[PDB]
User: Which sequence fits this backbone?
């Protein structure tokens, strides 16, 4: 992969050296996940950009193991996603070796001299256009599922916490302050406000007729 | 496990300890091993037992802590002695001798971290009291050792300067402080036979105070250079006048002389001193007198804040 | 752009070469969005760092088209924002041409030889200081609006979901496990539990006086 | 840091030069927060990768003051976390000086010629291992606290909004549409619907005994 | 799953194991593979029938282990029998002979 | 908090103060430190006793 009119001018070899030195300057490419575990936050990663020789063949790159995955958290308030094999994202490169920094998470020396290499880097997940946004969530922060049915659609004024199954909340002490529009029964402690009743003494144990009417 | 720690591994204590690893170690599969280390320079601040920080190391090295089970040794530095060596010359002028009161004093002074010593021979043996400090036995030598040396080393030195058939009398209750109560340090005789007994005592701690009245005359201003002079004299950095030693006595005139040799031209007016025991609060202005008897047993100490100077 | 004592010592030309080779090494600059569509996640972008010539004039950079925008998603659980023209962020550069990778989302060769250029890269949105955080949400993950009125303030213990208009939830099967403190009416199924009544046999159809009385 | 057989061959000299010029190329390293304020989104930062000299001593890098922190927002819908002292992440570097861009957020020249230096750049937070995920949130977008107690777990179908203390909602016009399963009292407007009652005319002022019962 | 258990993966048992893998093997999708190993030192060793510790991994592999079917050979060691060769010589003074108690 | 107040950080007053810090000083974490100042020009200037 060279040119004949090189080796003739000094600047020819100089620019060839500049190109070869900037070609190995690994910075940032798309990548796919070969392996991952959520407890350790390190994922085996196969880059998605091939190499090509003079004969014009693609040589697939090498898998990168134990690459930390970003979580975007401060004060412990991190954001997690279920990274699985087949996901795609972008892998970055570190200025220096982070193998010694990974195990300690503190001020540490670079273990090796491998500068600007994809051996040490990150993996920011990204779904690209592989997502469907509902028309009602046009201009709204939508945090949704794959196709999108459990979307949290925060708008400029209102919010819409959609889900197809349930909104099971484990909090015990809602301090809600506002009017509701629950168009259904209640089954409050198994009593069903919509069809509940009362008992009195005249008539005694008078099971009041009907259910719940204003 | 199976990680080799490289030499000259840094290890900083919380108040900038800056300890160095001197020899290489290998971690056994148990996960916890023991290493040895040294302080970087002449002085090393006392390392509070905590998890020592790791600065320079290999990839795997996790952490290292300190426990009281670890060993220690106390440095002593700073010519050591520079100009108080002239004072120590008259004391250790008979180091090369043995089996005498002066030789005992010289050798036990030559032990490290021994600020001062007192030796009484009580040679007119009739029990009684000789030169202060009562003596139970007729013939016996009493040694009061100041400072904070190691008991083993000072006991070895005391046995080396043995005199032969003089026992060690250190009783009389308040007279000194027994180092290990009855049946003191055993030590071993270099001429192999039995584990003998050597008895010496530690002087009673005393806290001293100083009140100074100065005029700040001659247009020379010195707000708090007085207590530095007083503490230097007490510690014995001056030439020809040993500081607060076991046989010393806190004297207003001596404090005044030290203050004056350090800085003249202030016209010192009052230099009351007084003194209290190791504990106790300030002795109140009523106690401040010109002298303290300060019997042979007992050592006074002047803190930096115990000197108060007043401008008039 | 040159200095006179260059072209005299070899190292002068060498470090000038290094400077010029590192000046064309595009990595990352702030950028603005001129076009965007949420269906394909590609945005026309104008970089916000001018070039400056010899005469000290700013020549504006060129608009970059079809730049993928990050979404931070894994397992289909992505996060989206209403990317509109005028928002600002940061644009990155790829180690190789990712145009062939973009349309395929799989292992592909670099289409051209353009290395480390802003022609191919990402755009991470970033609001910088253009937001207002309420005092109540000091130490709390706040996911909010521009000024902040629909903030989700997740604290270490409690969570406040504010919204000035409505908190509509489209799921049919809430499983709230606890109690509420809703201090208003209920209008459950249009019956207004707060002002509801009952009827019985004696008196027949005796409309219970008042609404809700404990 | 030099080799003897350098200074003999030209490409020995040239690759030494290339190594130095690439070493000065500051791109991306992990770092820590020394100071921060949420109002201005700039944080004093201490990098967490030491320098190394020939003696094999590590010299800590210099604090980088007034580095903007990413927020990931577009259209004003940004995401914020309580960035505090002692929290770790990764700092990036800008192609040119962004100092003139910071105070204006507009198209401006690079103030100086400092290229690819860490001292202008961003800080993206990241928690790495420092978080605990509950087993119930295995495959689910789960956003929690440090250890994880207020996790919003958006699953493929359901939503679990956990909170130890309260799930206070400040919205005034809830439009929830679906069956609820509140397993406790209601205290609706301080009336305790669970132990509620009614009063009728025959008997007059008759406290209908018991609460709600079918 | 599909971990590349690469050559000389350092492992260790109780008595300073230091055991390497002879050749790199890739994990089968089932999750159970068998590797061939050698010992760093050249001494008579008795590996325990329980997996003890591993050194090198991609953090995905849980652990190795030793089964009953595993082939273990206690190896000879130089001489270590250097002062006790003098002891063993008197016993084995008739190796070249046969058909006798001493030869046996 | 613990800010490295670099040397010759300048300040201004109402009557064109232009007074720099003398030497490098890092403020104590309490929230107040004592510094020294030098005026730029060689004319009699009287700063007002209010923080400006």
Assistant:
């Amino acid at each position: 992969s060279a040119k004949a009119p090189d080796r003739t001018r000094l600047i020819a070899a100089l620019d060839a050296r500049s190109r070869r030195d900037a070609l190995d300057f690994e910075v940032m490419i798309p990548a796919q996940v070969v392996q991952y575990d959520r407890a350790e936050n390190i994922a085996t990663i196969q880059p998605l950009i091939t190499w090509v020789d003079t004969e014009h063949n693609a040589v697939q790159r090498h898998q990168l193991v134990d690459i930390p995955v970003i979580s975007m958290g401060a004060g412990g308030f991190h954001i997690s996603f279920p990274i699985q094999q087949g996901d795609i994202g972008w892998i970055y490169a570190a200025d220096r070796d982070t193998s010694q920094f990974l195990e300690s998470l503190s001020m540490s020396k670079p273990n090796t001299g491998r500068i600007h290499k994809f051996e040490h880097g990150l993996f920011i997940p990204d779904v690209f256009r592989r997502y469907t946004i509902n028309s009602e969530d046009s201009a709204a922060m939508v945090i949704q599922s794959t196709s999108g049915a459990t979307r949290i659609s925060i708008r400029g004024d209102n919010i819409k916490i959609t889900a197809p199954s349930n909104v099971t909340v484990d909090t015990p002490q809602a301090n809600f302050t506002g009017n509701v529009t629950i168009a259904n029964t209640l089954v409050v402690n198994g009593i069903n406000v919509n069809n509940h009743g009362h008992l009195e003494n005249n008539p005694p144990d008078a099971r009041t007729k009907g259910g719940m009417i204003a | 496990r199976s990680q080799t720690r490289i030499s000259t591994g840094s290890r900083v204590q919380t108040p900038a300890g800056a300890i160095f690893t001197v020899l290489s170690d290998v971690t056994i599969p148990a996960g916890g091993v023991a290493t040895i280390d040294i302080k970087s320079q002449e002085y090393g601040n006392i390392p509070l037992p905590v998890g020592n920080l790791i600065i320079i190391d290999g990839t795997i090295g996790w952490s290292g802590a300190k426990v009281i089970a670890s060993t220690r040794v106390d440095p002593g530095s700073r010519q050591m002695s520079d100009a108080e060596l002239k004072n120590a010359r008259v004391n250790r002028l008979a180091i090369q001798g043995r089996n005498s009161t002066m030789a005992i004093k010289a050798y036990v002074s030559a032990v490290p971290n021994v600020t001062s010593v007192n030796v009484i021979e009580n040679n007119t043996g009739a029990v009684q009291v000789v030169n202060g400090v009562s003596f139970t036995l007729p013939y016996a030598v009493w040694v009061c050792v100041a400072g904070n040396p190691d008991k083993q080393a000072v006991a070895d030195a005391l046995w080396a300067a043995h005199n032969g058939g003089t026992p060690w009398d250190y009783g009389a209750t308040n007279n000194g402080v027994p180092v290990d109560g009855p049946n003191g340090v055993p030590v071993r005789d270099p001429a192999s036979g039995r584990k003998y007994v050597v008895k010496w005592t530690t002087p009673i701690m005393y806290d001293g105070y100083v009140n100074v009245t100065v005029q700040q005359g001659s247009s020379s201003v010195a707000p708090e250079a007085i207590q530095n002079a007083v503490v230097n004299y007490a510690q014995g950095k001056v030439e020809g006048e040993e500081g607060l030693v076991v046989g010393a006595s806190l004297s207003a005139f001596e404090v005044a002389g030290a203050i004056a040799r350090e800085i003249p031209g202030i016209y010192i007016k009052l230099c009351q001193v007084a003194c209290v025991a190791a504990g106790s609060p300030a002795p109140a202005p009523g106690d401040f007198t010109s002298e303290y008897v300060m019997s042979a047993f007992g050592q006074a100490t002047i803190s930096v804040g115990n000197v108060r100077v007043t401008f008039v």
User: Anything to note?
Assistant: The radius of gyration of chain A is 30 Å.
